[PDB]
Each structure stands twice: as C-alpha cells, then as structure tokens.
Amino acid sequence: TKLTEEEKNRLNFLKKISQRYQKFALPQYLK
C-alpha cells in the first residue's frame, strides 16, 4: 500500500527522532 506504509513509517520516524528531540520543547506533556 501507499498509505499504510507511510502512516506506519511516521510512527518509526517520530519515535526514532524523538530520542534526540526531547529538549527542543517536547510537546508530549500537556500544553
């Protein structure tokens, strides 16, 4: 597929970059 794959990738890319992107702001917690 073209949607499932991409959507499935975002979950990996986000979690992959999250490792380094946790100080810039971290929108995770409430805002």
Swiss-Prot record:
This is Casocidin-1. It comes from Bos taurus (Bovine). The chain holds residues 166 to 196 of 222 of the full protein.
